[PDB]
Curated annotation (Swiss-Prot), chain A:
This is Prolyl endopeptidase. It is an enzyme of class 3 (hydrolase). It comes from Sus scrofa. The modification N6-acetyllysine is found at K157. It is found in: Cytoplasm. Cleaves peptide bonds on the C-terminal side of prolyl residues within peptides that are up to approximately 30 amino acids long.
């Protein structure tokens, strides 16, 4: 079945580094250079064997035709009001990018306001971030090219959608916040650097600053408002309070949910914004999260996890700011995570909880924190919402495994609230009633109970005969909640698959303690939880090891790669997208220094000893047992992935092919695909998304010999 | 967001 030869890849046997006394060889270190002829030649050599492997089977074209048919459904965001006008995003089904529309009212005709599809021939220029002026009359928007995290911020006057001269460069991980006087906007930029800044470089990003751009001026005139030259990893994002009076500055360092909170009372600036602001350092440590909700005069409401791993709402009065004086507006729940909170219609709060990995949505009184209204949802996720302090209505969008969006609307000026379906879409093609979603909790190695969702056709026999696609992430306090994926439903319907999503530790499903039980010294908990989910699916007869595929992206690509190394007997197929594979060196490149809050950093001997045991690059090993080989493996990455630089996947595949691929017992393929004009995933055009899932499922179908079910 |  393997009609190709792995390319010959030079090993630099002199690349030896001492970590705390332990010598580590890195013979493919030269792949760290994205611009060398050698690296480009390796990528071309790998794509040359991967592409014909994936395309050779007719199943890919059947999958792509079906994905193109079933993904072609209208997709909408919530409506949102800005000034006198409503806006929403909309895709007729297959456009590369969704289009921003504007209307003068809800019953009014809609016009195209911003169509990113016209900015490139191939849909690889995407909107990334935007901010309307407080009165809704002006509009700032970030554009990214080829999926790079780099952004150019541009500006428009809303009435007539008139392009303005203002352009801001060197923007990345940036806030966008206009002052309420309409004069100009806060944003973040990084200093000049040598070499490229287009997403193909690996250069570390440090010394991010906060600037204020005055509309109608050149970027060279912008005001430096905050900088941390003795703390190069600090990132300070600005936002205005709802009354326009205070700039709040959230300073982060790494990815934990914590921040400093400094404020500037703009009434106390003698001369407007002319230099470094008069910051009051309200919270001047990284012990807790303080996420601004609203304020009334000097009484600020924040969502926090300060001594509340499931999060709660507190009121901090700037004129009586000592911690013993804070008021607890909505106390922490014993188990449910308060995920986010919005203030709407002056004195309402909308609170979204996660209860056993499903959202609930509640309305509360701002003054007392009392529950006023439950917004009833089916089982799934709230994935979009609109409703700010000045608005008198909300919209929110619900999704699940089996249903594409429902958008709800509620007019909050009414004495008796009636939330109503505002928009619902139906995918013709899949009968949702043919499938079920179950949630179960399975004991991990240490006995901890882990949630997992399983989606399958009703009536199946649990005789172990079904291919399965098990997904995990496990990290960064990210919760993996139900979402509609027509790509995965094609696997169910047309490949007879079972889908599974394991809510392993490292995620935020059960708050900061869930997150803590899968980071740093406990990172191996994520892997053990994920391997246990696989053994549960096998033991319960959903699938068998040879029919089981696992998949994860980024930190989830680290998850599945490490699982391939640790339990190659457990999986038939592994797809790792944009994975972090070199755990010893991740912190050196672009923004990777920020991940040491989850992983640790190999500069410390203690952290090094955790990382070396699971780092995918350093744990490739031929299974000892004569009858065990590695699963079939496919790594997917792209040449502008400046979030997780692609050298991770390049070095990993070189190593798989050399150590495992060369052996006689290995007959499962070990392949990489590197895409062009794309990056970590955000803003990827629909045409590339379709190509990507087509590759994944053709790899699966070919590797497991799965028949298409028309 | 700048998580992996």
């Amino acid at each position: 079945m393997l009609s190709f030869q792995y390319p010959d890849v030079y090993r630099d046997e002199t690349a030896i580094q001492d970590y705390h006394g332990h010598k580590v060889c890195d013979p493919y270190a030269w792949l760290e250079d994205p611009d060398s002829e050698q690296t480009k030649a390796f990528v071309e050599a790998q794509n040359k064997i991967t592409v014909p492997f994936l395309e050779q089977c007719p199943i890919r074209g059947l999958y792509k035709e079906r994905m193109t048919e079933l993904y072609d459904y209208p997709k909408y965001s919530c409506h949102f009001k800005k000034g006198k006008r409503y806006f929403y995003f909309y895709n007729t089904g297959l456009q590369n990018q969704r289009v921003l529309y504007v209307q003068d009212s809800l019953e009014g005709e809609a016009r195209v306001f911003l169509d990113p599809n016209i900015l490139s021939d191939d849909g690889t220029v995407a909107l990334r971030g935007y901010a309307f002026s407080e009165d809704g009359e002006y509009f700032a928007y970030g554009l990214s090219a080829s999926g790079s995290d780099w952004v150019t911020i541009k500006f428009m006057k809303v009435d007539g959608a008139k392009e303005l001269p203002d352009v801001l460069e060197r923007v990345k991980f940036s806030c966008m916040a206009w002052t309420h006087d309409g004069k100009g906007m806060f944003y973040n930029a990084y200093p000049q650097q040598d070499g490229k800044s287009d997403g193909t470089e690996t250069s570390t990003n440090l010394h991010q600053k906060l600037y204020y751009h005055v509309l109608g001026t050149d970027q060279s005139e912008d005001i430096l408002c905050a900088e941390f030259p003795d703390e190069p990893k600090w990132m300070g994002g600005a936002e205005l309070s709802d009354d326009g009076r205070y700039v709040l500055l959230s300073i982060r360092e790494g990815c934990d949910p914590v921040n400093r909170l400094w404020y500037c009372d703009l009434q106390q600036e003698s001369n407007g914004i002319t230099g470094i602001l008069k910051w009051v350092k309200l919270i001047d440590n990284f012990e807790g999260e303080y996420d601004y909700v609203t304020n009334e005069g000097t009484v600020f409401t924040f969502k926090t996890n300060r001594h509340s791993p499931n999060y709660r709402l507190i009121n901090i009065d700037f004129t009586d700011p000592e911690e013993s004086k804070w008021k607890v507006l909505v106390p922490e729940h014993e188990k449910d995570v308060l995920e986010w909170v919005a203030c709407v219609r002056s004195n309402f709060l909308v609170l979204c909880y996660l209860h056993d990995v499903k959202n609930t949505l509640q309305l509360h009184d701002l003054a007392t924190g009392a529950l006023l209204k439950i917004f009833p949802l089916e089982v799934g996720s709230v994935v979009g919402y609109s409703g700010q302090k000045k608005d008198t209505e909300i919209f929110y969008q619900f999704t699940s495994f089996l249903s594409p969006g429902i958008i709800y609307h509620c007019d909050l000026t009414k004495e008796e609230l009636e939330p109503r379906v505002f928009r619902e879409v139906t995918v013709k093609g899949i009968d949702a009633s043919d499938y079920q979603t179950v949630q179960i909790f399975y004991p991990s190695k240490d006995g901890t109970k882990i949630p997992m969702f399983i989606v399958h056709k009703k009536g199946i026999k649990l005789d172990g005969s079904h291919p399965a696609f098990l997904y995990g992430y496990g990290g960064f306090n990210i919760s993996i909640t139900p979402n509609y994926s027509v790509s995965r439903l094609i696997f169910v319907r047309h490949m007879g698959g079972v889908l599974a999503v394991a809510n392993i530790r490292g995620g935020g499903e059960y708050g900061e303690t869930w997150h803590k039980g899968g980071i740093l010294a406990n990172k191996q908990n994520c892997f053990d939880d994920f391997q246990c989910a696989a053994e549960y699916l096998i033991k319960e007869g959903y699938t068998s090891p040879k029919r089981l595929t696992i998949n994860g992206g980024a930190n989830g690509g680290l998850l599945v790669a490490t699982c391939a190394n640790q339990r190659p007997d457990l999986f038939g197929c592994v797809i790792a997208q944009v994975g972090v594979m070199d755990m010893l060196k991740f912190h050196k490149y672009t923004i990777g220094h920020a991940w040491t809050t989850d992983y640790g950093c190999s500069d410390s001997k203690q952290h090094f000893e955790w990382l070396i045991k699971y780092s995918p690059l350093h744990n490739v090993k031929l299974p000892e047992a004569d009858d065990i080989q590695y699963p079939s493996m496919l790594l997917l990455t792209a040449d502008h992935d400046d979030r997780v630089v692609p050298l991770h996947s390049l070095k990993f595949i070189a190593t798989l092919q050399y150590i495992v691929g060369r052996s006689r017992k290995q007959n499962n393929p070990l392949l990489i695909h590197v895409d062009t004009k794309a990056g970590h995933g955000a803003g990827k055009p629909t045409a590339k998304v379709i190509e990507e899932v087509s590759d994944m499922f053709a790899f699966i179908a070919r590797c497991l010999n799965i028949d298409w079910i028309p | 967001e700048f998580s992996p």
